[PDB]
């Protein structure tokens, strides 16, 4: 499950 927001392009989490 999601734990953080991905900074930058690619995966979002």
């Amino acid at each position: 499950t999601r734990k953080s927001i991905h900074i930058g392009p690619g995966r979002a989490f």
Partner: antibody, heavy 112, light 114 residues
Amino acid sequence: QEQLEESGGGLVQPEGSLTLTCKASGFSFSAIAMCWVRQAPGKGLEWIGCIATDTGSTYYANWAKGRFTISNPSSTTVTLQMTSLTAADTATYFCARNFYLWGPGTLVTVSS
Amino acid sequence: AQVLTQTPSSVSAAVGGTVTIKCQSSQSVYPNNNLGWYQQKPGQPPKLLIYEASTLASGVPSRFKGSGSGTQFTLTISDLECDDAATYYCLGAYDFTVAEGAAFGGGTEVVVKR
């Protein structure tokens, strides 16, 4: 081809409310984080919050919880509803996809 | 409640010189490389230079180098150019299930000497 554009800014009375809209072009949302960041005139960037476009789940800065609501009404729009506005809220408001694709910003000015 | 401390507030170097900017986080970013560096010129949105601590964004020259992990990160700008006159920001992202999801550093102004 992919772009974001903020709208809905402008002059608003102290203690008033305003809703900003962020419109995507050249793509539609597919399980991404759409985020709002602001910058007071001459100051640094300040995070407001993000929404996950598939679940509608939201994540805010502690200072912003309650007063700012991010929603996702369509596959190409997110909104930022802001209440009890104050001079400290005067700022350019940016929306961003995962902090890498940015709109040009829209100015909100809180004044009588 | 997240604290991301960016230093120095300003720095000057001549064309061809090197500038070093640091960000220190009270909590570790999550995952340990989840930090980005931005360049902002006046009247424009911030521009992503580096994400995942050290990955170059498209078109960004290699004289921009990010390093570090967890709670300590560095942006080193070498071979300085006039075009590098701008304000730079770090951004951290965190385990939002236990704390605030993100925070910007306070920014660093770069002045080009001539």
